[PDB]
Design an enzyme around this catalytic site. Structure first.
Site, PDB file in Angstrom:
ATOM      1  N   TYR A  62     -20.402   0.082  23.595  1.00  0.00           N
ATOM      2  CA  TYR A  62     -21.346   0.896  24.344  1.00  0.00           C
ATOM      3  C   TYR A  62     -21.107   0.766  25.839  1.00  0.00           C
ATOM      4  CZ  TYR A  62     -25.552   2.218  26.783  1.00  0.00           C
ATOM      5  OH  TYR A  62     -26.433   2.772  27.664  1.00  0.00           O
ATOM      6  N   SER A 117     -21.381   5.960   3.537  1.00  0.00           N
ATOM      7  CA  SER A 117     -22.184   6.868   4.336  1.00  0.00           C
ATOM      8  C   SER A 117     -23.515   6.223   4.664  1.00  0.00           C
ATOM      9  CB  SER A 117     -22.432   8.182   3.597  1.00  0.00           C
ATOM     10  OG  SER A 117     -23.335   8.987   4.313  1.00  0.00           O
ATOM     11  N   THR A 151     -21.623   7.424  17.084  1.00  0.00           N
ATOM     12  CA  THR A 151     -21.500   8.811  17.448  1.00  0.00           C
ATOM     13  C   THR A 151     -20.811   9.617  16.365  1.00  0.00           C
ATOM     14  OG1 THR A 151     -19.322   8.759  18.421  1.00  0.00           O
ATOM     15  CG2 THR A 151     -21.095   7.853  19.664  1.00  0.00           C
TER      16      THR A 151
END
Ligand SMILES: [Mg+2]
Length: 528
Positions: free
Chosen positions: A174, A269, A483
């Site tokens: 980040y 996922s 993201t």
């Protein structure tokens, strides 16, 4: 003709299809993609125009389903430029909005110890990331617990749904990938929003474009096992078949993967094993292990260089949290939230930092869905400690009905509302509710679990001939795993490697963290 088989239909494999068609001049016919009242907020929630280099480039080739002659990138940026973000009630404690005063959200509230550790983490070189193996954020800041009381922690953990027990590697990524957003983390002015929720603004434009180019979409096949060719040294990964089950008919079989065909798997996922309730029914936790990771876990029975999926799907304590979507038949509830928080719809999330469950809510620009009626309003909320009791509804959040979640939210809203008007209008507010749909996701932040380098497979493993991993659980350098850009990047890496496109043709990512001025401003921002 060569064929491509995508397992999972998320944005990563869709972008692989786009890359194959646009840059590889494939025919869509050769690509097969295999997936499986009131609204539900599905999909990614943020973007960033300064980052996401790959996403904007892929989406610049997908036409807008709403505006003739516009790409999805054009839609998204044209909208966002006309709807700039300035979060006002970003943090809300028991005394009110941290808009002013000593707890003003412009203050990171850092120690000298906090900045030393944070600066050490930020400045660690990418080549040294393995030094962080299995180190949580809690651990890296073990010596200065004051950190977990700062505005910065409250904003950072709720912005991305990070826990303190999560991987310190991402916090480092980040501070390097998102360095520009560090100085504006409190206003979230750097966040880029699409006009509607991303399923409608991104996914369906993508599927439509691909379907128009001939891509075959299948949603009855559960791919159950890879079939690999054996070799004497057993290093090479060569997929020869995909064992399937048809979940409607019951048929089982094998699809042959010929020499020259490529396979793209989404190994896991964040929405696997999620469950849903409604206004009067709490969720039922789906205890099954992440189904989209089973192909991965099974390949580790044959190859040694593919990672440890149990690191990501074996510790729900690290990964679980709970959300809900509210739909109302009038603007009243949204008007009240907008007034109490001193903020117009579409100005990023509002976090109740003293709430027991760490509840945040988001009011999007209205409408958020194409089928939203003129009179309807929608917003979204989530908490990071679903097991804890609510402050106003005194039961575990994960056990609440959709109504109870709204009631718990109103309690915090009412506590901030001095007029007492909202509490007075309770009966009318509740009568306006179309639905309140709780949504539990046991692996929602599993992509953040404590990890060591090598716990995630390479996008294209070192000896893989035709298997690629396109997911938020594949290994990629630099990019933030939160993201949507991450999965899009995996796709370009895989497609370009399989097709023989050299890596200097990969999309160039911005490196603001080596501009001395950016570093300088970042350094100054440490004392804000
Ligand atoms: Mg912007």
């Amino acid at each position: 003709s060569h064929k491509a088989y995508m397992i999972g239909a998320g944005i990563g494999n869709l972008s692989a299809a786009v890359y194959l068609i646009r840059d590889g001049e494939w025919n869509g016919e050769d690509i097969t993609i295999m997936g499986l009242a009131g609204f539900i907020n599905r999909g990614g929630r943020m973007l960033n125009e300064e980052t996401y280099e790959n996403l904007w480039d892929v989406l610049s080739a997908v036409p807008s389903l709403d505006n003739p002659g516009k790409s999805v990138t054009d839609d998204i940026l044209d909208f966002d430029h006309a709807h700039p973000t300035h979060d006002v009630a970003r943090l809300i404690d028991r005394d009110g909005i941290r808009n002013k005063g000593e707890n003003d959200y412009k203050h990171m509230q850092f120690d000298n110890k906090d900045r030393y550790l944070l600066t050490k983490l930020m400045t660690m070189p990418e080549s040294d990331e393995a030094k962080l193996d299995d180190i949580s954020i809690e651990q890296w800041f073990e010596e200065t617990p004051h950190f977990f009381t700062t505005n910065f922690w409250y904003m950072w953990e709720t912005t991305f749904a990070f826990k303190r027990v999560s991987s310190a590697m991402e916090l480092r990524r980040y501070m390097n990938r998102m360095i520009l957003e560090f100085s504006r983390i409190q206003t979230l002015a750097g966040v880029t929003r699409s006009p509607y929720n991303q399923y409608e603004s991104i996914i369906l434009p993508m599927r439509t474009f691909l379907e128009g180019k001939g891509v075959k979409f299948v949603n009855e096949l559960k791919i159950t096992e890879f079939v690999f060719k054996d070799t004497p040294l057993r290093d090479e990964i060569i997929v020869t078949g995909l064992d399937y089950e048809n979940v409607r008919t019951g048929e089982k079989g094998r699809i042959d993967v010929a020499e020259g065909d490529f396979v793209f798997d989404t190994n896991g996922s964040i929405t696997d094993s999620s469950s849903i309730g409604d206004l009067d029914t709490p969720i039922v936790e789906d205890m099954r292990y992440a189904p989209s990771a089973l192909l991965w876990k099974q390949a580790t029975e044959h190859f040694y260089d593919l990672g440890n999926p149990d690191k990501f799907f074996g510790d729900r304590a690290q990964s679980e949290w709970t959300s809900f979507t509210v739909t109302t038949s009038s603007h009243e509830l949204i008007n009240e939230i907008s007034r109490i928080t001193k903020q117009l719809p579409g100005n990023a999330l509002n976090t109740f930092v003293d709430s027991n469950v760490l509840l945040s809510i988001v009011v999007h620009h209205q409408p958020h869905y194409h089928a939203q009626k003129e009179n309807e309003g929608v917003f979204w909320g989530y908490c990071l400690f679903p097991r804890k009791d609510g402050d106003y509804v005194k039961k575990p959040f994960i056990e609440m009905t959709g109504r109870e979640m709204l009631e718990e939210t109103l309690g915090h809203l009412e506590a901030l509302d001095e007029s007492g008007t909202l509490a007075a209008r309770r009966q009318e507010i509740m009568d306006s509710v179309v639905n309140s749909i709780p949504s539990h996701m046991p692996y929602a932040s599993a992509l953040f679990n404590r990890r060591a380098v090598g716990d995630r497979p390479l996008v294209v493993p070192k000896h893989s001939k035709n298997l690629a991993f396109i997911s938020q659980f594949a290994e990629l350098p630099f990019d933030m795993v939160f993201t949507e850009q991450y999965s899009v990047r995996c796709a370009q890496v895989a497609v370009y490697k399989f097709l023989g496109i050299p890596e200097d043709k990969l999309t160039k990512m911005h490196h603001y963290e080596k501009d001395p001025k950016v570093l300088a401003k970042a350094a100054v921002t440490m004392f804000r």
